[PDB]
Design a protein around this ligand. Structure first.
Ligand code: CLA
Ligand code: CLA
Ligand code: CLA
Ligand code: CLA
Ligand code: CLA
Ligand code: CLA
Ligand code: CLA
Ligand SMILES: CCCCCCCCCCCCCCCC(=O)OC[C@H](COP(=O)(O)OC[C@@H](O)CO)OC(=O)CCCCCCCCCCCCCCC
Ligand SMILES: CC(/C=C/C=C(C)/C=C/[C@@]12O[C@]1(C)C[C@@H](O)CC2(C)C)=C\C=C\C=C(C)\C=C\C=C(C)\C=C\[C@@]12O[C@]1(C)C[C@@H](O)CC2(C)C
Ligand SMILES: CC1=C(/C=C/C(C)=C/C=C/C(C)=C/C=C/C=C(C)/C=C/C=C(C)/C=C/C2=C(C)CCCC2(C)C)C(C)(C)CCC1
Ligand SMILES: CC1=C(C/C=C(\C)CCC[C@H](C)CCC[C@H](C)CCCC(C)C)C(=O)c2ccccc2C1=O
Ligand code: SF4
Ligand code: SF4
Lengths: 80, 73, 64, 165, 41, 107, 209, 73, 107, 226
C-alpha cells in the first residue's frame, strides 16, 4: 500500500492518531521529546492516504509524512 | 500554406511544452546539487524566486496594458 | 542554560521550515536533552495556521 | 511623414471619416425639433466631434491609409519630429503617479510594521497618517533614490524567506 | 463618533473614498476637457 | 405600438450619447426591457406625478422597513416561541398577506 | 441644571455646559472627541459670524431698495454688480481666495497651536493675533475691548452664538422664501404684516401643491 | 493592429514561459512543500492541509501551461 | 441549431457598433471575457498559485514592501466558488446581451 | 540656526531645529533633508540652481529694462534664440550646444569631485599649478579664484549674513524665472511689458483674466456677464 513515515521532529501531541480514521498510527514511548511519545505506523497497509495526520501535524515541517503509490483494495477505500 | 503553418506552429508549441516539462523532470528526478555546486545551474536555482517574479511582472504588465488598449479601442 | 536566552530574538536557518531566514522569539529551551529543545514563537502564522515551532541548537542564530 | 504616414491635416480618409460621422450625426437631427433637449444634446455631441477632429489635426498627428490617427513610439523619432506629445511625456506622467502610489504604499508598510500587532492596520486603516504620506509623496523619486543609496530600500537576503529548492 | 470613525477608517475609506474621489476627478477631466490623444499642453 | 419604452438616461460624459437611442416621442435614452411601462398601463397610471408619489411612498416604506428591522432586533426582539408559532404564521400569511393583498389588488 | 433643547431630556456627556449656547442638542454624537469638539466649535463660530454678516448685508440692501435707492435683490446682486465693478470676475475671486487663504491658514494654525501667531512673525505683533479661547481671538480683533470682564464676556458669548444661530435660520429662510416668492425679504415681511391671515407660506402657489 | 496582436503573442509566450519556468524551478522544492522531490514528478496533491495543495506538482504546472500554449498558438 | 440560431442571429450584436445597441456588444464581449476568465479558477488548484504567491512575496520582501497580512492563495472551496460565480456571470451576461440586442434590433 | 519660520505654528522637522544653515526657515514638509549627506547634496543643488537663476534672471531683466528705456534694441528672451540663430555672424546651434555641454561637463566634474571628496581638487601638480587654491571651504562655497575681490575671508557674521542674502535672492530668482517662463507661456509677452500692464491696469491684467492660467474661468465670466 502507501508508505507512512514519522520523523524525529514529532513532539508527541498524540493528535495525529485521533485524526486518522483507519487506526494506521500509534503512539510509542520515546526519549527525544518532552512528551516522551512518538508516532508509529504498524498498520501502514490499511492506510488510504487521506493526509488527515498531515493536517493535524503542528510541526513545521510535518513530522508524519504519507506518500502515495501502489494502491490496493484497502488503500483505495473500496467496499466492493 | 495555412494548414502547413498551423500544423507546424501547434507542433512547435506542444514540443516546447514537452521541453519544459522534461526539464522539470530533470530537476526533480536526476539533479544532484553537490555534483555541480556553485555553477550556473545551482545559482539559477538559488535565485529562482527572482526569475519567477520577473516573469510574472512582465506577463502581468503585458496582459494589463494589452487588454487595456484592446478594450479601450 | 545550553541555548539562547529566553525572550531573545533568534534567526532560523532550517531550510524546510516555513520560517527560514526569519526572526522568532524564544519562549522556552528544554534542558532534558531532547532532539529539538529550543521553542520559538513567530508573529506570522504558517500555512497550517500555527505560530510556534521547535528547532535544534544549530538551527538558531542571533540575527544581525 | 514617417513610416509612410500622411499628416492628419492633409489626409483625405480623415476628412472622409469626419464627414461620415457628421452625416450619421445629422441623420438623427431630422427627427427632433430644433428647440428640444435631445436636439441640444445632439448639437453638443456634434460640436464635441468637430472640436475633437479639429484638435487632433494640426497637433503633430499622422494617419495612414485608414483615416485613423497613428502614434509614434520610438523616442528620438518622436523628438526630431514633433511627436513627443504622443507617448514620450505621458510615459513619465504615468510613471510619476505609479511611483507615487508605490512610494506611499511602502511608507505606510514600514510605518505600520513598526507598530504592535501590525496586521490590523491593513484592515483598519488610519486616515491622518495615510493622508500625511499621501501629501508627502510628491518627491517620490528623490526619496526612492536616497533609500536605494543608503541601503534601506532593499533588505539582506539573510533576512528574506527563501525557497529551499 | 469615536466608534463610528473607527468603522469609517476600515474598508470604505480605501474602497469607497478613494474610488469615488479618483473616479469623479477623472470624470470631470474627461467632461470639462474633451477627449485628448496627444499631450500638446 | 410605435414608441419604444425607455426609463434609463445616460450622461453625455464620454461617448455615451450614442447610447441614448431614438426611442421615439421626442425622447432619447436606453430602450428598457423590464416591461415597467406595460405594468404602469395595467394599473391605472397616467402622469409622472403618480409615479413620483409611488416612488416617495416606496422610499418611506423602505425607511419604515429598515427601522422595523432595527427595532425588532436591537430594541424589541421576539423570543423563540414567537417564531415557533407556525400555525399563527401560516394563518396570518395565508389569510392576511396573500389574501388581503389579492383583495386589495382586486379592489 | 440648565435649559436644554428638549425639556426633560438627557444632555450629552461631552456637552457639560461649558460652551456658549450649550443646550445639549447633539443626537448624532458629533464633536465627541476634544479635537473634533474644538474643530466643531470653530466651524460653528465662523459659520455664525459669516451668517450674521451676510444676513445684515442682505437686510440693509433690501431696506435700501425698499426706501427707493437703486439696490438690487439679495439674489443676483453680483450679476449686476460685476457690470459696474472695476474689478472683473476671476481677478476678484482669486484676490479673495489669496487673502482668505492667508487669514484662514493663520487662524487654523492658531486653532491647532494656541498662541502660535502671537510670536511676532507677522509684522511683529505679539499680544495681538494671539487667541484667547477656542474660537475667540483677541488683541487686534477686540479694539473697544468689552471682553475683559468675565461675566460680560460670557454673556456676550451667549448672545453671539444665539444671534448667530438665528442668522443661520435667517439665511435658510431667505433662500427658501426667495425660491418660494421671487421677492425681497423686506417685501415678504411687508406682505406678511399687511395681510397676515391670507398671505403666508401656504398661499404662495409653490411649495404647497 | 499587427503590433497589438504581436504584443498579444508576446504576452502568451511570456505567460507560458512564466508558468513552465516556475514549475521547473519549484519541481523539487517550494516553501509550501520542501519535499516535492520525494513525491515524484506526477503526483496529485498533498491534501487539504496547509491551506490546500491542489495542482502543486510540476506535472500540473505543465498541465495548466498547455492551456496557455494552446491559447498562444 | 448553431448556424440558424447563434449565427443567423447575433449579426446585430457584432454590427451594433456606432449605434444605440453598441453597449450590448460591449456587454457581450465583457461577458465573453468573464466567462473565459473563470476557467482559470476552475481547472487550476491552490498549490501552484500558493507557490506563485510565495515568489511574489519574495519579490516584495526584497525591497521591503511586504504586507503585514501574509498573502495567501484562495481556498479550494473559495476557488471553486470564484470560478462558478465568474462562469455564471459571464454566461448570463452573454445570453442577456445577445438576446436583448437581437430582440431590440429586430423585434 | 533657526531663523524665522516658513509657516508659524507648523511642526518644524527634527533635522531643521538645531541645524546651522543659510536661509533655514523649516520648509521641509516632505522631510527630504532628514539624511545629512542628502541635505548636503540638496544644498549644493539649490546653490547651483540659484546662482544660474541669478544669471538667467539678470539676463531677462537688465536687457529688458534697457530695452524699455530705449537704450538698446535687444529683444525679449523668448525670441532672442531665434534672433541669434537667424543672425549673420552666428556660430551654429550644434557647435554652441556642444561647447556649452563640454565646458559645463568639465567644470561640473570638478565641482562633483569637490563634493564627493572635500578638497580633492587641490591635488598638487594637477591643474597647471593653479589648483592649490581649488580647495573647497564648504559645500557649495569653493573660494579661491571664485572670490577674487576678497569679500569672504572676514568674520563669520557677515559671511553667513551674505550666505543668507545669497540664498534669499537665489530663491527669489528661481521663482522669478519660473514666473518668466509661465508668463511667456500664458501672456506671450516679456516680463517688463507684463509689469507695465499690471502697473497701468491692475484689475484687467492678471493671471485670472488670462484663460491659459486657469481654464474655464473665461467661460464663467462670460456666463456671469450674460
Ligand atoms: C481568456 C481568459 C483568461 C484571462 C483573461 C486570463 C488572465 C490571466 N491569467 Mg489565466 N488562465 C486561463 C484563462 C484566462 N486567464 C485559463 C483557461 C487557464 C487554464 C487553467 C489559465 C491559467 C493560468 C495560469 C496557470 C496563470 C494564469 C495567469 C494569468 C494572468 C497573466 C498576466 C497577464 O496577462 O496580465 C493580466 C491579464 C489580464 C487579462 C488582466 C485582467 C484584469 C483586468 C485589468 C480587470 C481587472 C478588474 C477591473 C478593473 C474591474 C474591477 C471590478 C471587477 C473585479 C468586479 C492574468 C490575470 C498567470 C498569473 O496570474 O501569474 C501572473 C498564471 O500563472 N492563468
Ligand atoms: C520525443 C520527445 C519525447 C520523449 C522521448 C518523451 C518521453 C517521456 N516523457 Mg514526455 N513529453 C513530450 C515528448 C516526449 N516525451 C511532449 C511533446 C510532451 C508535451 C505533450 C511531454 C510531456 C510529458 C509529461 C508531462 C510527462 C512526460 C513523461 C515521459 C515519459 C513517459 C511518457 C510515456 O511514454 O507515457 C505513455 C503515455 C501514453 C501512452 C498516453 C498517451 C495519451 C496522449 C499523450 C494523449 C493524446 C490525446 C489523444 C488521446 C490522441 C488521440 C486523438 C484521437 C482523436 C485519436 C518518458 C520519459 C512522464 C514522465 O516522465 O513520468 C514521470 C511525464 O510525467 N512527458
Ligand atoms: C527598444 C529599443 C529601440 C529601438 C529598436 C529603437 C529604434 C530606433 N530609434 Mg530609438 N531609442 C530608444 C529605444 C529604441 N529605439 C531609447 C530607449 C532611446 C532613449 C530615449 C532612444 C533614442 C533615440 C534617438 C535619440 C534616436 C533614435 C532613433 C531610432 C531609429 C534609428 C536607430 C538606428 O539607426 O540605430 C543606429 C545605431 C547605430 C549603432 C529607430 C527607429 C533615431 C531616429 O529618429 O531615427 C530616424 C534617433 O535620432 N532613438
Ligand atoms: C503599494 C504597495 C505595493 C508595492 C510597492 C508593490 C510593488 C511590487 N509588486 Mg506588488 N501588489 C500589491 C501592492 C504593492 N506591490 C498588492 C496590493 C497586490 C495584490 C493585488 C500586489 C500583487 C502583485 C503581483 C501579483 C505582482 C506584484 C509585483 C510587484 C513588483 C512590480 C511593480 C508593480 O507595479 O507590480 C504590479 C503591481 C500590481 C499590479 C498591484 C497593484 C495593486 C495596487 C496598485 C496596490 C494598492 C496599494 C495601496 C495603494 C497602498 C496603500 C497606500 C497607503 C497610503 C495607505 C513590485 C516589487 C510583481 C512582481 O513580483 O514583480 C517583481 C507581480 O508579479 N505585486
Ligand atoms: C473626484 C473627481 C471630481 C472632481 C475633480 C470634481 C470637480 C468639480 N466638480 Mg464635480 N462631481 C464629482 C467629482 C468630482 N468633481 C462627483 C463624484 C459628482 C457626482 C456626485 C460630481 C458632480 C458635480 C456637479 C453636479 C457639478 C460639479 C462641478 C464641479 C466643479 C466645481 C466645483 C469646484 O469649484 O471645486 C473646485 C474646483 C477646482 C478646479 C469642479 C471642477 C460643477 C460644475 O460643473 O462646475 C461649475 C457642477 O455643477 N460636480
Ligand atoms: C396578517 C398579518 C401578517 C402579514 C401581512 C405579514 C406579512 C409578512 N410577514 Mg409575517 N408574521 C405574522 C403576521 C403577518 N405577516 C405573524 C402573526 C407572525 C408570527 C407567527 C409572523 C412571522 C413572520 C416571520 C418570522 C417572517 C415574516 C415575514 C413577512 C413578510 C414576508 C415577505 C413577503 O411576502 O413580502 C411581502 C412584502 C411586502 C408586502 C412589503 C410591505 C411590508 C409591510 C410594511 C409589512 C406590513 C405587515 C404587518 C403585519 C403590519 C403590522 C405591523 C405593525 C406592527 C406596524 C411579509 C411582509 C418575513 C419577514 O421578516 O419580512 C418582514 C419573515 O421572515 N412573518
Ligand atoms: C529645485 C531647487 C531647490 C532645491 C534643490 C532646494 C533645496 C533646499 N532648500 Mg529650497 N526653495 C526653493 C528651491 C529649491 N530648494 C524655492 C524655489 C523656494 C522658494 C519657494 C525655496 C524655499 C526654501 C526655504 C524657505 C527653505 C528651503 C530649504 C531647502 C532644503 C530642503 C531640502 C529638501 O527638502 O530637499 C530638496 C528639495 C528638492 C530637491 C526639491 C525637489 C523638486 C520638487 C519635487 C519639484 C518642485 C516643483 C515646484 C513645486 C514647482 C534644501 C537645501 C530649507 C532649508 O534651509 O533646509 C536646509 C528652508 O528653510 N528652501
Ligand atoms: C495640504 C493639503 C491638505 C492636507 C491635509 C492632510 C495633511 C496631513 C495631516 C497631518 O498629519 O498633518 C500633520 C503635519 C502638519 O505639518 P506641519 O505642521 O509640519 O506643516 C507642514 C505642512 O503640513 C503645511 O501644509 O502634516 C505633515 O507633516 C504632512 C505635510 C505634508 C505636506 C503638505 C504641505 C506641502 C504640499 C506641497 C504640494 C506641492 C508639492 C510638489 C512636489 C511633489
Ligand atoms: C442652517 C445651517 C446649518 C444647519 C445645521 C443643522 C440644523 C445641523 C444639525 C445637527 O448638527 C446638529 C446641530 C447636532 C447633530 O448631533 C445633529 C445634526 C442634525 C446633524 C447653516 C447655514 C449657514 C449659512 C451661512 C453661513 C450663510 C452665509 C451667507 C453669506 C456669506 C451671504 C452672502 C451673500 O452672497 C449672498 C449669498 C448673496 C448676496 O446678494 C449677498 C451676500 C452678502 C454677498
Ligand atoms: C543572426 C541574426 C541575428 C541574431 C539572432 C540571435 C542572436 C538569436 C538568438 C536566439 C536565442 C538566444 C534563442 C533562444 C531560445 C531559447 C529557448 C527556446 C530555451 C528553452 C529552454 C528550455 C525549454 C529549458 C529547459 C530546461 C529546463 C526547464 C530546466 C533545466 C533543463 C533544461 C535546460 C532542458 C540578428 C537578430 C542580429 C539579425 C538577423 C540574423
Ligand atoms: C487565479 C487563482 C488564484 C489567485 C487569486 C487570488 C489570490 C485572488 C486575487 C484577488 C484580487 C487581489 C482582488 C482584487 C483585484 C484587483 C486588485 C482589483 C483592481 C481594481 C481597479 C480599480 C484597480 C487562486 O488563489 C486560486 C485558488 C484555487 C483555485 C484557483 C485559483 C486561481 O485560479
Ligand atoms: S501529529 Fe505530527 S508532531 Fe503531532 S504527535 Fe503526530 S507525528 Fe508527532
Ligand atoms: S493518510 Fe489518513 S489513513 Fe493514512 S496514516 Fe494519515 S491520517 Fe491515517
Amino acid at each position: 500500500a502507501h508508505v507512512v513515515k514519522i520523523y524525529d521532529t514529532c513532539i508527541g501531541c498524540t493528535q495525529c492518531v485521533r485524526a486518522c480514521p483507519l487506526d494506521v498510527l500509534e503512539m510509542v514511548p520515546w526519549d527525544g521529546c518532552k512528551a516522551a511519545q512518538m508516532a508509529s505506523s504498524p498498520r501502514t497497509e490499511d492506510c488510504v492516504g487521506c493526509k488527515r495526520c498531515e493536517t493535524a501535524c503542528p510541526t513545521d515541517f510535518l513530522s508524519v509524512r504519507v506518500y502515495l503509490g501502489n494502491e490496493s483494495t484497502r488503500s483505495l477505500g473500496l467496499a466492493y | 500554406q495555412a494548414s502547413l503553418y498551423t500544423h507546424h506552429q501547434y507542433i512547435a508549441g506542444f514540443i516546447m511544452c514537452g521541453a519544459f516539462a522534461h526539464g522539470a523532470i530533470f530537476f526533480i528526478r536526476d539533479y544532484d546539487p553537490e555534483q555541480n555546486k556553485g555553477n550556473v545551474l545551482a545559482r539559477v536555482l538559488d535565485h529562482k524566486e527572482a526569475i519567477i517574479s520577473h516573469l510574472s511582472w512582465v506577463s502581468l504588465f503585458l496582459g494589463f496594458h494589452t487588454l487595456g488598449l484592446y478594450v479601450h479601442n | 542554560e545550553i541555548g539562547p536566552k529566553r525572550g531573545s530574538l533568534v534567526k532560523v536557518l532550517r531550510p524546510e521550515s516555513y520560517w527560514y531566514n526569519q526572526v522568532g522569539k524564544v519562549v522556552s529551551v528544554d534542558q532534558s536533552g531532547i532532539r529539538y529543545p529550543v521553542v520559538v514563537r513567530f508573529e506570522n502564522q504558517n500555512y497550517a495556521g500555527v505560530s510556534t515551532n521547535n528547532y535544534a541548537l544549530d538551527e538558531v542564530t542571533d540575527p544581525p | 511623414d514617417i513610416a509612410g504616414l500622411t499628416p492628419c491635416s492633409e489626409s483625405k480618409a480623415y476628412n472622409k471619416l469626419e464627414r461620415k460621422e457628421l452625416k450619421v450625426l445629422d441623420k438623427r437631427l431630422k427627427k427632433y425639433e430644433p428647440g428640444s433637449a435631445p436636439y441640444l444634446a445632439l448639437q453638443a455631441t456634434k460640436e464635441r466631434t468637430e472640436n475633437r477632429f479639429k484638435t487632433y489635426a494640426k497637433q503633430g498627428l499622422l494617419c495612414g491609409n485608414d483615416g485613423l490617427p497613428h502614434l509614434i513610439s520610438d523616442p528620438g523619432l518622436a523628438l526630431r519630429f514633433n511627436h513627443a506629445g504622443e507617448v514620450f511625456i505621458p510615459t513619465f506622467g504615468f510613471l510619476y503617479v505609479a511611483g507615487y502610489i508605490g512610494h506611499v504604499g511602502r511608507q505606510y508598510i514600514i510605518l505600520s510594521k513598526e507598530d504592535a500587532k501590525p496586521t490590523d492596520k491593513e484592515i483598519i486603516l488610519d486616515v491622518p497618517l495615510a493622508l500625511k504620506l499621501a501629501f508627502q509623496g510628491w518627491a517620490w523619486p528623490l526619496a526612492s533614490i536616497q533609500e536605494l543609496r543608503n541601503g534601506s530600500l532593499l533588505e539582506k537576503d539573510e533576512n528574506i524567506t527563501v525557497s529551499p529548492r | 463618533m469615536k466608534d463610528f470613525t473607527t468603522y469609517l477608517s476600515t474598508a470604505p475609506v480605501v474602497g469607497l473614498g478613494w474610488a469615488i474621489f479618483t473616479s469623479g476627478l477623472l470624470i470631470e477631466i474627461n467632461r470639462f476637457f474633451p477627449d485628448p490623444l496627444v499631450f500638446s499642453f | 405600438t410605435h414608441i419604444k419604452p425607455s426609463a434609463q438616461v445616460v450622461w453625455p460624459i464620454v461617448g455615451q450619447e450614442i447610447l441614448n437611442g431614438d426611442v421615439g416621442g421626442g425622447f432619447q435614452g436606453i430602450q428598457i426591457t423590464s416591461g415597467f411601462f406595460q405594468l404602469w398601463r395595467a394599473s391605472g397610471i397616467t402622469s409622472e406625478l403618480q409615479l413620483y408619489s409611488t416612488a416617495i411612498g416606496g422610499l418611506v416604506l423602505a425607511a419604515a422597513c429598515f427601522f422595523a428591522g432595527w427595532f425588532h432586533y436591537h430594541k424589541a426582539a421576539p423570543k423563540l416561541e414567537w417564531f415557533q408559532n407556525v400555525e399563527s404564521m401560516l394563518n396570518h400569511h395565508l389569510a392576511g398577506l396573500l389574501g388581503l393583498g389579492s383583495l386589495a389588488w382586486a379592489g | 441644571d440648565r435649559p436644554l433643547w428638549s425639556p426633560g431630556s438627557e444632555p450629552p456627556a461631552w456637552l457639560d455646559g461649558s460652551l456658549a449656547g450649550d443646550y445639549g442638542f447633539d443626537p448624532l454624537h458629533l464633536s465627541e472627541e476634544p479635537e473634533m469638539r474644538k474643530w466643531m466649535v470653530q466651524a460653528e463660530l465662523v459659520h455664525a459670524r459669516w451668517a450674521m454678516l451676510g444676513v445684515a448685508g442682505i437686510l440693509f440692501t433690501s431696506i435700501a431698495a425698499k426706501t427707493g435707492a437703486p439696490f438690487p435683490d439679495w439674489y443676483d446682486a453680483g450679476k449686476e454688480a460685476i457690470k459696474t465693478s472695476p474689478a472683473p470676475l476671476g481677478s476678484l475671486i482669486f484676490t479673495e481666495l489669496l487673502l482668505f487663504g492667508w487669514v484662514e491658514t493663520k487662524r487654523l494654525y492658531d486653532l491647532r497651536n494656541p498662541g502660535s501667531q502671537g510670536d511676532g512673525s507677522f509684522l511683529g505683533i505679539t499680544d495681538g493675533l494671539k487667541g484667547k479661547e477656542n474660537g475667540y481671538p483677541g488683541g487686534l480683533f477686540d479694539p473697544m475691548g468689552m471682553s475683559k470682564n468675565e461675566a460680560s464676556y460670557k454673556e456676550a458669548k451667549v448672545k453671539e452664538i444665539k444671534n448667530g444661530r438665528l442668522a443661520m435660520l435667517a439665511f435658510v429662510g431667505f433662500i427658501a422664501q426667495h425660491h418660494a416668492t421671487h421677492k425681497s425679504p423686506i417685501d415678504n415681511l411687508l406682505d406678511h404684516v399687511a395681510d397676515p391671515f391670507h398671505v403666508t407660506f401656504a398661499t404662495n402657489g409653490v411649495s404647497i401643491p | 493592429g499587427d503590433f497589438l496582436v504581436h504584443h498579444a503573442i508576446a504576452l502568451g509566450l511570456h505567460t507560458t514561459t512564466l508558468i513552465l519556468v516556475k514549475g521547473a524551478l519549484d519541481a523539487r522544492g517550494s516553501k509550501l512543500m520542501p519535499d516535492k522531490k520525494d513525491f515524484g514528478y506526477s503526483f496529485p496533491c498533498d491534501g487539504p492541509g496547509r491551506g490546500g495543495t491542489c495542482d502543486i506538482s510540476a506535472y500540473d504546472a505543465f498541465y495548466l501551461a498547455v492551456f496557455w500554449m494552446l491559447n498562444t498558438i | 441549431w448553431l448556424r440558424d440560431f447563434l449565427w443567423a442571429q447575433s449579426s446585430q450584436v457584432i454590427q451594433s457598433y456606432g449605434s444605440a445597441l453598441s453597449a450590448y456588444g460591449l456587454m457581450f464581449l465583457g461577458a465573453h471575457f468573464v466567462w473565459a476568465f473563470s476557467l482559470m479558477f476552475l481547472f487550476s488548484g491552490r498549490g501552484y498559485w500558493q507557490e506563485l504567491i510565495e515568489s511574489i512575496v519574495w519579490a516584495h520582501n526584497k525591497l521591503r514592501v511586504a504586507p503585514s497580512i501574509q498573502p495567501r492563495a484562495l481556498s479550494i472551496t473559495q476557488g471553486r466558488a470564484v470560478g462558478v460565480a465568474h462562469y455564471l456571470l459571464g454566461g448570463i451576461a452573454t445570453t442577456w446581451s445577445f438576446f436583448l440586442a437581437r430582440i431590440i434590433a429586430v423585434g | 540656526s533657526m531663523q524665522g519660520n516658513w509657516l508659524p505654528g507648523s511642526q518644524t522637522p527634527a533635522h531643521l531645529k538645531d541645524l546651522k544653515m543659510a536661509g533655514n526657515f523649516g520648509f521641509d514638509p516632505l522631510n527630504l533633508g532628514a539624511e545629512p549627506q542628502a541635505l548636503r547634496w540638496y544644498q549644493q543643488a539649490e546653490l547651483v540652481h540659484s546662482r544660474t537663476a541669478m544669471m538667467g534672471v539678470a539676463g531677462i531683466l537688465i536687457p529688458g529694462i534697457f530695452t524699455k528705456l530705449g537704450a538698446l534694441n535687444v529683444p525679449q528672451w523668448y525670441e532672442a534664440g531665434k534672433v541669434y540663430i537667424e543672425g549673420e555672424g552666428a556660430i551654429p546651434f550644434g557647435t554652441l550646444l556642444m561647447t556649452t555641454l563640454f565646458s559645463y561637463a568639465f567644470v561640473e566634474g570638478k565641482r562633483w569631485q569637490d563634493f564627493r571628496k572635500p578638497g580633492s581638487q587641490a591635488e598638487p601638480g594637477t591643474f597647471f599649478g593653479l589648483e592649490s587654491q581649488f580647495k573647497g571651504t564648504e559645500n557649495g562655497y569653493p573660494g579661491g579664484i571664485f572670490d577674487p575681490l576678497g569679500y569672504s575671508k572676514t568674520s563669520p557674521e557677515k559671511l553667513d549674513e551674505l550666505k543668507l542674502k545669497e540664498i534669499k535672492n537665489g530663491r527669489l530668482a528661481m521663482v522669478a524665472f519660473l514666473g518668466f517662463a509661465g508668463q511667456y507661456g500664458a501672456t506671450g509677452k516679456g516680463p517688463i511689458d507684463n509689469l507695465a500692464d499690471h502697473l497701468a491696469d491692475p484689475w484687467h491684467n492678471t493671471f485670472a483674466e488670462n484663460g491659459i492660467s486657469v481654464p474655464g474661468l473665461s467661460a464663467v465670466e462670460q456666463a456671469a456677464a450674460n
